[PDB]
């Protein structure tokens, strides 16, 4: 690795021990634009990467074609973090790198609940949801203990990395376009904190953004 010097207010606060988790970030809903902030606050040997898809892309020109590779990369942790990203390069290893980097800036937390009696730790989404990308759409359905992941290959990875165990699924549209299939399943998971349930409502006391709190630091850093 070649070293990090932060260009963001956020990044400074992460690079010293003030912000010690990604849930502080997630709360006040600040954007992450330096991949090193996800590296810093998530322990190593607990991230699981992999490449869902690598694929050629062309364009037409005079004399012949022009070729550019492309790639999809998915990343996350079984405590409820996941992201996805896809990018392009004119060589192979390029697109690989650029995907991984992208993916670590679309990290989003995932909420889990129960199907029935509340015992143990949550193994399943609390509700039905949907996502749509392109024509192809995806629906995720709660299921009881031991039901397991009943899904196609493509979705099953998304779910497994999230920390969702038992589930069921179904889809419509052309599911054979893989890039859209991925992104659909991703948009699905997101919306479990996008929906409001009697578990919550209470009008919680709200808190100041880390920037306000730690403002002392960031002033000195300017000088």
């Amino acid at each position: 690795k070649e070293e990090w010097v932060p260009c963001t207010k956020l990044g400074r606060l992460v690079k010293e021990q003030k912000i010690t988790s990604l849930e502080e970030i997630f709360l006040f809903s600040m954007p992450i634009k330096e991949h090193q902030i996800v590296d810093q606050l998530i322990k190593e040997s607990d991230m699981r990467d992999e490449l869902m898809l690598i694929v050629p892309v062309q364009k037409a020109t005079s004399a012949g074609q022009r070729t550019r590779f492309k790639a999809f990369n998915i990343v996350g942790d079984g405590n409820g973090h996941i992201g996805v990203g896809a990018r392009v390069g004119k060589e192979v290893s390029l697109a690989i790198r650029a995907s991984m980097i992208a993916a670590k800036l679309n990290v989003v937390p995932i909420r889990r609940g129960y199907w029935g009696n509340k015992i143990g730790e949550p193994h399943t989404i609390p509700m039905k949801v949907t996502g749509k990308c392109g024509s192809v759409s995806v629906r995720l359905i709660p299921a009881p203990r031991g039901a397991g992941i009943v899904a196609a290959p493509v979705p099953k990875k998304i779910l497994e990395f999230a920390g969702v165990e038992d589930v069921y699924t179904s889809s419509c549209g052309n599911t054979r376009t893989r890039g859209n299939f991925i992104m659909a399943t991703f948009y699905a998971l997101r919306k479990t904190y996008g929906f409001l349930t009697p578990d919550l409502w209470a009008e919680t006391e709200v808190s100041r953004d880390p920037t306000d709190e730690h403002s002392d630091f960031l002033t000195m850093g300017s000088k």
Partner: protein, 207 residues
């Protein structure tokens, strides 16, 4: 105020200023945003803005700007010549940063650039010139205070203060007020005396 002390409420001198310098004279045109703040009109069809609710919004604004930990997390934006002085002058008293001239997209959303800024507050002066800046504040979580007329889009404008912005005098006086009432609350220039800086510094002067 809360447990009302009956400061921060209009007095004779307030009214006198805002009448004279034509801060209650608006545009002919209307929009569904501004129809609450409009109050009657003339045979010219020139809408006349309420004083009372201008003042309330104006107070509210100040209480934002002087909440801030460090003044440099406020920026003040304009593009129009007549306001392009009073930006400077306001900033120099309060201690805020500013952005002058045309607005360059890539000053709030670009990761790595020559000019990159992350203010916690903002001010425009019109949302119909300054439009580009509003857009970029949608994506960086920045609340925007704005001066307005009797027209104005309010998309991505959290707080709207109805004003005039059609002449030198109009823009000046608003900034002059805001500078006063921020200093009074914070670092205590006193409100027993009149304030000592004079208007004309803020006023645009023709070349």
């Amino acid at each position: 105020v809360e447990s009302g002390a009956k400061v921060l409420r209009m007095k004779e001198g307030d009214v006198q200023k805002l009448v004279a310098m034509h801060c209650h004279l608006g545009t002919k045109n209307r929009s569904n945003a501004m129809k609450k703040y409009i109050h009657s009109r003339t045979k010219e069809g020139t809408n006349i803005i309420d004083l009372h609710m201008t003042w309330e919004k104006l107070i509210l604004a100040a209480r934002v700007i002087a909440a801030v930990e460090n003044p440099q997390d406020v920026t003040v934006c304009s593009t129009r010549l007549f306001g392009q002085r009073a930006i400077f002058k306001f900033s120099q008293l309060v201690g805020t940063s500013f952005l002058a001239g045309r607005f360059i997209p890539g000053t709030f959303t670009n990761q790595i650039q020559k000019k990159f800024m992350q203010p916690r507050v903002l001010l425009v002066t019109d949302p119909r010139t300054d439009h580009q800046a509003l857009r970029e504040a949608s994506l960086v979580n920045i609340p925007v205070i704005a001066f307005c007329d009797t027209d104005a889009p309010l998309e991505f404008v959290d707080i709207a203060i109805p004003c005039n912005n059609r002449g030198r005098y109009s823009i000046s006086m608003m900034y002059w007020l805001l500078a006063r009432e921020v200093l009074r609350l914070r670092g205590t220039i006193p409100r027993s005396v009149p304030w000592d800086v004079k208007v004309d510094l803020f006023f645009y002067r023709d070349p």
